[PDB]
Design a protein around this ligand. Structure first.
Ligand SMILES: CC(C)CCC[C@@H](C)[C@H]1CC[C@H]2[C@@H]3CC=C4C[C@@H](O)CC[C@]4(C)[C@H]3CC[C@]12C
Ligand SMILES: CC(C)CCC[C@@H](C)[C@H]1CC[C@H]2[C@@H]3CC=C4C[C@@H](O)CC[C@]4(C)[C@H]3CC[C@]12C
Ligand SMILES: CC(C)CCC[C@@H](C)[C@H]1CC[C@H]2[C@@H]3CC=C4C[C@@H](O)CC[C@]4(C)[C@H]3CC[C@]12C
Ligand SMILES: CC(C)CCC[C@@H](C)[C@H]1CC[C@H]2[C@@H]3CC=C4C[C@@H](O)CC[C@]4(C)[C@H]3CC[C@]12C
Ligand SMILES: CC(C)CCC[C@@H](C)[C@H]1CC[C@H]2[C@@H]3CC=C4C[C@@H](O)CC[C@]4(C)[C@H]3CC[C@]12C
Ligand SMILES: CC(C)CCC[C@@H](C)[C@H]1CC[C@H]2[C@@H]3CC=C4C[C@@H](O)CC[C@]4(C)[C@H]3CC[C@]12C
Lengths: 605, 162, 81
């Protein structure tokens, strides 16, 4: 194989240290290889002399580490600077020390030695990204089935402690960048590292799931710079709505980032994720208003043109949902989302109500079944308008705190169902002694007790049902046992409106004071997830979007038949990358000097 | 003109409400009232978050409920008043129900039975999930938001009162 | 960036003067309340004849204005002294 032939002598030295560390008894790395189920090229297809002698080759180890970070994580290692013909290139020795320090760094996590990993982290380059990848792979490798066993007990534990050390270390280099310059930190965190398949570092944080790194305000400054198209003029919601409503009267007058420069400024404005988000919010608002005017107005004897507009609108919504499901992510990724399932049930509710309308357009009963089917579409579509509230700062943690509080809501429903079913069966049996069972007795159980919790204590209607003829409201009755409905009603409203609802109040106060900060850190993770979702959105809004899918069909005309697809990517300057690397080395040396002074300045030390 | 006197009293009712509301601006000299005003002005963002949460439930149940009790009706202004009117006062407590039984034209001795439209006895179920979403979820989220809001900015409201 | 830490730590030193100012008021409230009320109604002639609580309000020192000796001076400035 030519992959082992292109491996240099330092890769054989790291493979010799892996074979030397794996020859010890009760080693976790031999249990890691024996539970890997991979090939010697690193593919997971599950020759034997190459699988015994060269099983600890560094490309197979790097593929096991790229699987161990995430499902879609990948690394890229170039050994072609290790030839002797590139010795006269400038900086090839520095990239050789960077690639060898990264490989010995990943071996140092793989042997769980902390100070050697600190030394290869300090002499390495791209320190923040490698610290995030380390902290993720050591925190996942501590909780792994290959490290199960008592004799690898404390190396299960304390290396996880060391994993949290790298997480704290990574935050402080970001804090050292936020100690130095915010604009150089924003140029740092938009830089795509070429060894990690040209991915920016906040996507490395989201794939590494570092919630402590993503809750930092410098990362939120980078994410809010990745909102609004990196344009520092229109940052308000109403200012972006006034810029979207009047594009020609605002965008020459706005600040910058000829006719081609104004066209590049308008193309930078409409490729913002905030502009596509307010276009999707405006398209969903026009959808809910036009389906509200459809369902409130009476349906005609024939098909109306507004029903054809709703058919084309939800046909474009179903085409965008099938394009997000099939050709974008996968079925298991799209089925895990809550709002995708709400979009699928409003597609099914509209098509059930439209098929109930279009089966018999002349029947008024079929129009009654169509409006009763479409009332679910009204409730689910206005409830799906709440999914655009995650971009607001004051609304998103209230949604995550309500989703945390719904377990206490379900505990209150499971407590109140006891009191409601017991008082409802006892009360409806007690006011009607001589009555046969029917459906209306079950409606009389399940109906009135509920609305006596929420406040309407129907009482006259209970005095009329009880047939009590006294001037006192429960007196002179026919049945002598029929004047105990108050007493059951009295102990029911003491059990409902003075016990369980105020237990909710105490449960919501303890629930909100528990998970307020965790709902804030989950809002920061949903903020970068919403910015990454609307960065990959189509530029058109929703009833144009199927026509934009026709433009994706024009990409199909660039795909296989014409095969004339031309694409390019922006290449950064080498002086700006060298300034970012010198900025990273100066901020890392300043943070390790300040952290050594802060560790020596503690009371216990 | 008596109609101009009716327009003058309907214009002056705003002057009554704004003048009695401007009488609250003399409460800042009191020690026990001024931090309650600064804590209410801090708490009005959580009030506006509760209005933005409740407008979803009110507009959705109002359009679905007024469309469901009147299937065969043309659109007018009174359908929009029937959306925006009754759902609100069902949060604050008056669950109009007889009036909904009279509007639903159900002739049974049971309060939602023997109706003309067979789909018209689902207004309770939407009313049931609406009062669980309003009077048991969002208002008590205000309670938790006001407790965390007051325990946040009580001392800052005191220093702003100084 | 090169005036970075002189951005930061002097702000730390700024809070030091704020704490220092409160304690001299506390030393005045250690000594005599009537001499502190005669102190804080005195108009300094180098600052266009302004009393020191107006210097605190123009200086926006909320830690100085939340002190009870300053509230004794403000409630002496209520009720006509
Ligand atoms: C204290 C409780 C839990 C124990 C059991 C008490 C029950 C079985 C007793 C206590 C008082 C009783 C009631 C007292 C008087 C009357 C009037 C009579 O014309 C019909 C029966 C009726 C209405 C009784 C029904 C049964 C009753 C409710
Ligand atoms: C269960 C615990 C909490 C206490 C038990 C209280 C019950 C058994 C008592 C309390 C008040 C009582 C009622 C008081 C008065 C009357 C009117 C009389 O014409 C028939 C019995 C009747 C309707 C009683 C039935 C039993 C009653 C409901
Ligand atoms: C502080 C709280 C517990 C107040 C006490 C409430 C109790 C004692 C009151 C509230 C409502 C009352 C009932 C109201 C009406 C009737 C019907 C009458 O024909 C017999 C008595 C009876 C059944 C009463 C019994 C006592 C009663 C149950
Ligand atoms: C579980 C939900 C969300 C999925 C969709 C269910 C909807 C479309 C179905 C479920 C039960 C259905 C109702 C069941 C029975 C009747 C009686 C019939 O004479 C008129 C239609 C009517 C009133 C149906 C209307 C549509 C209906 C409400
Ligand atoms: C949406 C989730 C929470 C559950 C769905 C419940 C819905 C689909 C169910 C629950 C109870 C059902 C109702 C129960 C009984 C009747 C009376 C019948 O003569 C017509 C259908 C009607 C009016 C049903 C319509 C559908 C209904 C409202
Ligand atoms: C603990 C809580 C959830 C109690 C459960 C409340 C539910 C199950 C109850 C409350 C009110 C009830 C409704 C009241 C009236 C009617 C009209 C009738 O023609 C069909 C059933 C229907 C539509 C009931 C269905 C069940 C219902 C929605």
């Amino acid at each position: 194989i030519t992959a082992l032939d292109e491996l240099p002598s330092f890769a054989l030295a790291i493979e010799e240290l892996y074979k030397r560390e794996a020859k010890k008894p009760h080693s976790h790395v031999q249990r890691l290889v024996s539970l890997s189920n991979t090939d010697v090229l690193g593919r997971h297809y599950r020759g034997r002399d190459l699988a015994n002698t060269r099983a600890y080759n560094v490309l197979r180890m790097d593929q096991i580490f790229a699987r161990l970070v995430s499902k879609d994580f990948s690394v890229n290692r170039d050994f072609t600077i290790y030839d002797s013909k590139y010795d006269k290139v400038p900086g090839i020795q520095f990239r050789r020390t960077a690639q060898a320090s990264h490989m010995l760094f990943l071996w140092a996590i793989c042997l769980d030695r902390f100070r050697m990993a600190r030394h290869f982290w300090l002499i390495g380059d791209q320190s923040i990204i490698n610290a995030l990848v380390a902290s993720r792979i050591l925190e996942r490798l501590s909780t792994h089935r290959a490290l199960q066993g008592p004799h690898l007990a404390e190396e299960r534990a304390k290396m996880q402690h060391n994993a949290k050390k790298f997480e704290e270390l990574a935050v402080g280099v970001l804090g050292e960048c936020h100690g130095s310059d915010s604009h150089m930190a924003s140029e740092m965190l938009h830089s795509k590292n070429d060894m990690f398949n040209k991915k920016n570092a906040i996507n490395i944080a989201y794939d590494a799931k570092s919630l402590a790194f993503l809750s930092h305000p410098a990362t939120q400054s980078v994410i809010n710079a990745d909102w609004y198209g990196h344009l520092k003029s229109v940052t308000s919601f109403w200012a972006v709505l006034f810029a979207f409503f009047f594009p020609f009267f605002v965008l020459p007058f706005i600040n910058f980032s000829g006719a081609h420069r104004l066209r590049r400024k308008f193309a930078k404005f409409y490729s913002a994720p905030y502009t596509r988000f307010i276009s999707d919010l405006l398209s969903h608002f026009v959808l809910c208003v036009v389906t509200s005017y459809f369902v409130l107005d009476k349906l005609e004897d024939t098909i109306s043109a507004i029903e054809w507009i709703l058919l084309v609108w939800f046909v474009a919504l179903l085409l965008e949902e099938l394009r997000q499901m099939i050709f974008c992510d996968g079925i298991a990724e799209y089925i895990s989302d809550t709002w995708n399932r709400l979009d699928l049930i409003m597609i099914t509710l509209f098509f059930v109500g439209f098929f109930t309308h279009a089966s018999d357009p002349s029947n008024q009963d079929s129009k009654v079944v169509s409006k009763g089917i479409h009332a679910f579409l009204v409730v689910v579509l206005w409830l799906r308008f709440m999914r655009y509230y995650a971009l607001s700062k004051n609304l998103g943690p209230k949604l995550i705190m309500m989703m945390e509080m719904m377990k206490d809501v379900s505990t209150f429903v499971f407590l109140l169902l006891i009191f409601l079913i017991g008082y409802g069966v006892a009360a409806q049996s007690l006011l009607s002694p001589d009555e046969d069972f029917s459906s209306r007795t079950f409606i009389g159980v399940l109906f009135r007790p509920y609305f006596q919790i929420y406040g309407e204590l129907f009482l006259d209607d209970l005095n009329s049902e009880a047939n009590c003829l006294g001037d006192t409201p429960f007196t002179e009755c026919s049945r002598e046992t029929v004047r105990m409905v108050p007493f059951f009603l009295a102990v029911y409203i003491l059990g409902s409106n003075v016990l369980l609802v105020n237990l909710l109040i105490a449960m919501f106060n303890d629930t909100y004071m528990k998970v307020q900060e965790a709902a804030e850190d989950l809002w920061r993770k949903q903020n970068y997830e919403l910015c990454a979702e609307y960065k990959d959105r189509p530029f058109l809004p929703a009833p144009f979007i199927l026509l934009a899918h026709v433009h994706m069909l024009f990409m199909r005309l660039l795909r296989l038949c014409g095969v004339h697809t031309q694409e390019h990517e922006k290449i950064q300057d080498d002086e700006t990358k060298r300034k970012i690397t010198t900025f990273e080395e100066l901020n890392t040396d300043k943070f390790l000097r300040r952290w050594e002074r802060e560790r020596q300045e503690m009371l216990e030390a």
